[PDB]
Amino acid sequence: PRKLLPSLKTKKPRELVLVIGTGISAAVAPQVPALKSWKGLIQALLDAAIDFDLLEDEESKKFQKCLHEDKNLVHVAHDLIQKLSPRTSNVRSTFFKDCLYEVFDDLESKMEDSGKQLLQSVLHLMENGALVLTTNFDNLLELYAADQGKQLESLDLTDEKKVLEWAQEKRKLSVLHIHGVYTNPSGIVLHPAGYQNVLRNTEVMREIQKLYENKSFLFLGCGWTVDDTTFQALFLEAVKHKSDLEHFMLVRRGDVDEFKKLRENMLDKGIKVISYGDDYADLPEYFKRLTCEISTRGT
Amino acid sequence: PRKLLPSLKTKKPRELVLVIGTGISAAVAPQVPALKSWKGLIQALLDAAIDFDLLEDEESKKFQKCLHEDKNLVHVAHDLIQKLSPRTSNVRSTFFKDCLYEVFDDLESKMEDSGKQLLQSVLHLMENGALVLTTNFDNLLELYAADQGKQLESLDLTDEKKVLEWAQEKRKLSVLHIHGVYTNPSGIVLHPAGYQNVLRNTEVMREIQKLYENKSFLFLGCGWTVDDTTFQALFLEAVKHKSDLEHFMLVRRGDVDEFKKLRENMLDKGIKVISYGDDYADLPEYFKRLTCEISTRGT
Amino acid sequence: PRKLLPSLKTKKPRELVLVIGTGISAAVAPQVPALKSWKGLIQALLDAAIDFDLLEDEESKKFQKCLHEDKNLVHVAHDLIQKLSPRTSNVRSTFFKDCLYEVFDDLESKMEDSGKQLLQSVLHLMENGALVLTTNFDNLLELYAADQGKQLESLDLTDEKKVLEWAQEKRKLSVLHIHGVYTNPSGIVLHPAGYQNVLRNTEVMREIQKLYENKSFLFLGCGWTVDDTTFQALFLEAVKHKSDLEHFMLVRRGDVDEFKKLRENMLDKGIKVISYGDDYADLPEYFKRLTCEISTRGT
Amino acid sequence: PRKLLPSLKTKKPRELVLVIGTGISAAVAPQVPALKSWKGLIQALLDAAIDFDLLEDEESKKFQKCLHEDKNLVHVAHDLIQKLSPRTSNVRSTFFKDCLYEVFDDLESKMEDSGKQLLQSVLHLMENGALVLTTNFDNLLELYAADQGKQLESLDLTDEKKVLEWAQEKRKLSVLHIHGVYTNPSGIVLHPAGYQNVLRNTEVMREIQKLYENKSFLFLGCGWTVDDTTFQALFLEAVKHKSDLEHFMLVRRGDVDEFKKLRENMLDKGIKVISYGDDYADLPEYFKRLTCEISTRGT
Amino acid sequence: PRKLLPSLKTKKPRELVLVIGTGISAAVAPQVPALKSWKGLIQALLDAAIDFDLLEDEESKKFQKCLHEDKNLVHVAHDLIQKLSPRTSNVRSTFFKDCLYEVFDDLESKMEDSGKQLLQSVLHLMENGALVLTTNFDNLLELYAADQGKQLESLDLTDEKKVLEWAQEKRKLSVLHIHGVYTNPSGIVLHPAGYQNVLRNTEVMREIQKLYENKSFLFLGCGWTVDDTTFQALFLEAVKHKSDLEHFMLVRRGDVDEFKKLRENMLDKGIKVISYGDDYADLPEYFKRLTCEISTRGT
């Protein structure tokens, strides 16, 4: 039932950037164990590796214990890729690409109108000439933009040249991935070395400063999605000025204390917070009236 | 059924001062109880900040009790401000500013002509040399100043040099606010600290002594607000031979006992109390009689 | 019961190549000395030839002891093309044919419909413009197409004009016995004279090379599908040439270390693999799932 | 092991032509020596039990030594017959006819029942549309076919019309004698003039030469047949298509040279050699099976 | 004894006409002057006439000498007949019939057992419908019918209505004694008057000519019946078919050179010759076996 916070309502779309997270996948296909949990992603890819015969039943017991070894799942996942598969410079090496193509298909069938109303709002924000960044293996945004009649161009960390062009504010039609993409598993980075090899283009950290001070971001995700390791590293090594940052997260009006705690946590982080609702299909209408009223005020 | 007083009409406008409260805002935009009186603004903040989830339940109970209580408006304001403000003030901070922006919400949306005829009348006194001072966040004259082209700006707290030049009659057009500048919400000057913040520039009060002794003052839309502690301190600092002066007042009531007691306190201030304007038209017609001539061809 | 491979699922019918190994025709007739093994084929040919009074024991039983060597026998059988028939080749002689026509018997009667599922799948793929190669003398596919009411043509690597039309997808009416079909024994290409024949008609060599580079093959039967002598010679040179290409072969789970090392060697050549325990019944089931995918990609 | 070879088996009844050589008449009716060879035929001139063989006992011993000499016996038997019956020139007689008829009458108790199985086969194919022809001096087939119920007509090289009307496939229920037959004594020729009768009838030569290139000719008991000067005059003469005829001989095979020798010369003429196991009884077993296959393929 | 010589044995009773000189009686009884050859019948007729004292000395010398000299008997016998059988009213006599009664006396004792076998076989053929004609005026076959228990009707050309029924087969078991008969003196002739007596009924003449062209004729011991001008004039001198005529004669191998010489003479005349025996009994041994063939083929 909720309403425009004037700070946003007064901000112009020209100011804005957004982050994409789990809530879109949770609208589309929340039954999929992996899309709710990265230890569920380990289970799913372990099932596929067993179906492939990459590693034995005794290894399957060790990897089941790895499901129980929660936290730093980003690192555990890098290790599991490398345990299963080499990072070769040559050959379209098989089983791993197939394994992710199997996980990538048959999400598009699931797409709810709840997703379509987020997506239409999002597409208008994109059309306003913004920048967008994603945690998501899921790419529903790119495909559905084509159902809405439009191209979408998707970008990845190892395409560091396009990371730079996104940060330079140049690319319209644009989304950046931190993690998986349908293009090539080789794009993936998950151990800290892969991430920091991109960050070692240190001028990009100075463009992260420019954006993070100057513009206003809005985030979709678990909220812990800003707390995930490379998000912490990339943003916090770029900006020490917790005072001078300029940007928001979206949060669920479930338990009152979850959003209070998160609001204070983000305040302590140097980050801004807004709340909507518990339900995973209450967000779209809230987001729609919010979005068109911002873009029509920007007009 | 209403009349002018000869001593007011016989002064030259350079001789006159005016003091303004909520009834003029009710002439510009009667639409909200907040515009009729400050108590409605408490209900507006309560509604808005609950709708945000920026008021929690015990905070809401305090402000519900403020609506029961009606303390001195200084203490109402301080009570309201202090719980309304969530903060850790190293970061630039936000939420109370949005609450003001939604509670005010850009009153071009609520305009009416009867109030703007009052503004044009008072402003013409200022053209032939009159001065004006006022309580609230109601920048409404400044809306009409942008319509009428007599260049004007809103002053409170921080610019005592400019206040001195205007009180020193070096410039005719400026607007003086007294509660504190709304763009400093946690700061708001409705506290005992406001008495000492005026004392920082007793030289501004020295010109206000000169004005209050020499000039004749007209009081509009005011009430017990001018018997609240900040106005008591201002008046004691302005003159102590307090009864002797000539000043005029127009007011309405809840019951006649208010007007008996108010007329005694007004006369102790030097002020003569009159009643009309159950609806606006009495004041425009009183101003039509006071203007002498609309054609400007006889005199 | 077991997972399709996405990378294989991707391609159009027109895009794909299919090869019918000796294990596959042995699934078309799981009772047949002509198909059980090459050692069995030679043994049965010789023993059947003496059963018709065509030959004498001295050479035959001495070479039978040589069969215990299990090796060189493919070319020793071509040396037997000298030995076995009394020889003239311009006059329409019979004895070599008499053996191979005693061998090409029972035909359809041995087929399970389960094998016919695979053959029907092939027939619908060939209807969509696909292309079929086989290691086998035996036109059981063409006879099955006539059982389901329509012509297929039987074709040889000594009928190079029709091989070129077949290879360009034009002669989809025809099925290419790589070693030649039983019907005309002099035609046969398991003989090194047939390997030379692929060079003698350069268009055959070109079409093999062209098709490897341009398009993806799916290979079926046994390790011996790849390993048998003409396949080893022609097709392993094509993967001595290199472009990191993608191709497919079907295997049973078996000895997993041999399977792994084979899979590695195949990957090093440029081939991708599918592997399951307990042999036959899953191959028709899985192949039919793949067939409807390819069929829907055609339509 | 008495299995059936393919290339012969391919044919339906009308496609085939059957040559009944001297040994089959002997095999069909062995109760008198006279059938059993050309030495038997000449011996029959001596088997005469009446005074009017026109020779001396010393001339009889000379011609007995001609049987020891392996002489020009086809012509020498004619010369002997001309010396046995010099009536005047071409005038009528009884004595040759009396000898012949007394030898040749009463055939059906002189038969084998296994020989009646062979003749059953002959008749069965002939009614199913064959061509049947003989050298031999005996209507054995016609009399046995009358015992079966069939009113068979006997033909020879006197009425060239009847030879050709057999050749047209028209004379169902008829049998054709080339060297001649007893019931028509003045039609018999062992000398060249009988061969000259068909060489003169170029239309019969054209039928035999048509049957030679395209049709299949098969020969039974035929150790001499294909090497008869009469056969070479009747058959080969104009046409050299020997490389591409489709013709067949059966003989008992027990030494390797028997097939090798026979094959080489037969392939020079254009004919295909076939084994049977151990004795002549195997040949009616093979040929009766082949006959019911020819019938069932035809009808 | 003689083996069978089929060509004569073929003939049915109604296909048979038997030619009867004395020679049947010669073979039956070679010891009697009346029987040896037709000159012996005329000698016995002359002997009977001389015992009756009927004839002149110079006529008797003429007859005896002419019968020994092998002259043409027709005129010798006719002269004896007309001398004995004068033809007026008062100068008339029977004597030639009375001489026939003396000549053919006691023949049933005179017969050999071979001769009785011959006559039994002839009578058996006559009862089975065989046709018979005789130059003898005799009762000899009518006497052997009496031996057997049978009787026969005796005719000459001038008994023209009964001879027409004989000739038209209506009187089988009647016998025509061409030259006259023991029942009738006026008929008896061997002459152009005999050709007239054949003509005397033209239907009888036409039947007689028809027999020799159409039927088969058999001659036995015809040591003059070959030369009868009556038999010559129609059969030898007015039938053209001599090459083709299916006629038969039995002659005795008393010398093989007599048989060669007689074969030459008779086949030149138009008469076809068959050879038998050392002595006359060999003809009855064949003739009974032959008679059984004739009757069984006639049945």
Numbering used by the authors:
A (entry chain B), B (entry chain A), C (entry chain C), D (entry chain D), E (entry chain E): 28 to 326
What do the authors report?
Here we identify family with sequence similarity 118 member B (FAM118B) and FAM118A—two understudied vertebrate proteins—as vertebrate-specific sirtuins with similarities to bacterial antiphage sirtuins. As expected, the FAM118B sirtuin domain comprises the large Rossmann-fold subdomain and a small α-helical subdomain but lacks a zinc-binding module.
We recombinantly produced and purified full-length FAM118B (referred to simply as FAM118B) and its slightly truncated variant lacking poorly conserved and likely flexible terminal regions (designated FAM118B24–334), both with a noncleavable His6 tag. Despite the apparent helical symmetry of the filaments, an asymmetric reconstruction approach produced higher-resolution densities than helical reconstruction, similar to what was observed for another filamentous systems, likely because of structural heterogeneity within filaments. Both FAM118B and FAM118B24–334 structures show essentially the same assembly where each successive protomer is translated forward and rotated by approximately 40° around the longitudinal axis, creating a helical arrangement.
